[PDB]
Design a protein around this ligand. Sequence first.
Ligand SMILES: N=C(N)NCCS(=O)(=O)O
Ligand SMILES: N=C(N)NCCS(=O)(=O)O
Ligand SMILES: [Cl-]
Length: 541
Amino acid sequence: IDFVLSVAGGFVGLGNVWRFPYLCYKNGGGAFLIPYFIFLFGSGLPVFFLEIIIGQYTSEGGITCWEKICPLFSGIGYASVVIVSLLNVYYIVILAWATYYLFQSFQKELPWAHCNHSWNTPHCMEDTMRKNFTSPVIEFWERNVLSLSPGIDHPGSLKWDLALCLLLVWLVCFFCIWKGVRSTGKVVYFTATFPFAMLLVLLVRGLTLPGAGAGIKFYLYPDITRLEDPQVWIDAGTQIFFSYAICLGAMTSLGSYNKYKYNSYRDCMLLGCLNSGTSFVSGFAIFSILGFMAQEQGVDIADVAESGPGLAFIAYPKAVTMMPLPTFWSILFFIMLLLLGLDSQFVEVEGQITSLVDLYPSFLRKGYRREIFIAFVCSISYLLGLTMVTEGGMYVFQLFDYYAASGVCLLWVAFFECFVIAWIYGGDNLYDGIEDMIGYRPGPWMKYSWAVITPVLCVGCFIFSLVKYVPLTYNKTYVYPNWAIGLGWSLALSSMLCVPLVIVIRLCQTEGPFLVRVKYLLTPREPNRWAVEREGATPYN
Ligand SMILES: N=C(N)NCCS(=O)(=O)O
Ligand SMILES: N=C(N)NCCS(=O)(=O)O
Ligand SMILES: [Cl-]
């Protein structure tokens, strides 16, 4: 009765509603979809299935699973932990923004509708009378919500309204992890069907707006010359990794909770197509609104909103103003955004705690209270997130969004996950394990993706991005300083360096000749030991 689908109905998140439309709009629109679908069926679903299978087979979390499959490349798991840490720093900042918008909805007139407010510049023209001039919806996002600075080197002053909204979300996250609400009960029906109900209303509203056809044509019809830019492939390929929450140890930890004899192949395909289908369908909502905005303002569709983060805060808030009782719909939309983000944030932050606690089960569990450790992790993450709340903190958010938990850092982890399984552990060796679990031998799709398709895409994007290097920009105009780019690369290299560092550490610890050390550290350590004894299973090899 699709019980697993309802339980796993939380596949839709902020990556499908917020990040996907902004990445697609930034990369020209239709040209973004081709790499998106190439990575979807070549390295998006296969890596998701690989992580789920590793979790279900080894019956271990993010790090111990690699400790069992291949000790030498154990650092992969460590890298994932680092990645998730950075994610928890910035992924919650969006929620703060949403919370701010929520507190701005509790009034008779939505503030992003007219140009008679204090923060509005003299260049504010209402879109109705539009046909220099700036839209009131954009100015509220910039002049009021963000209070944007000239650059990242100008941090300005901390925003005391967003700081209190950021703390409010962290208190909710801390309380929902300290007590572990886990959203268990009959609220699962509401928290899984309400986002689709609101996205349907936005979709119907967006489609019926005058000029939506121009926006959809921009969204669908591709620009072939745009594909020659390497950044399109990195943005689209990593977006699959972002929405699928892979290369983080979350799916491997999730996979470990599945029974050994359980057909998780059908679930990964079902959830993968539903998660990516949600992003594609939600794209018709955003871009139909953008087509309407371009139509009335007399501007090009690519120059009517922010290319960076916040497209969902300029397009969706405007669509609300056209619905009857805009106050009612504005509240519901940002309640949906809060529900989608909080559900994802609870899983990742609590997953981060589990990985760190399991690393030191004698100290963080008995000697030092795990309850205090949850407060310590949240407190440190909150302080680091205050760098994205200052007036110049929007530029810091883009650096974290572009480099941390995205870009080459995920391609680095994805490549080594597939390389170890396909070329060291063995695709046929895993297929024998998968055959026992799911009950049948899968097709050659997974085997060829782990061995050829994924490594080629991951290493191909990395090489071509370096050969044709375009520095990160914000909203197509702002040019980051050299230190900001260097700071951004340090965020990516913080986790990328974990894979080779552990290899060096493992070799030093082991004794004997160098060749003996490598061969010893490549041998799996009983990958399915628990399976044969706790349940019914065939021992590996
Ligand atoms: N677990 C899923 N499907 N996604 C996680 C990332 S996001 O969709 O919440 O951004
Ligand atoms: N924010 C969530 N839930 N997932 C992000 C996945 S990743 O981009 O860090 O791989
Ligand atoms: Cl997506």
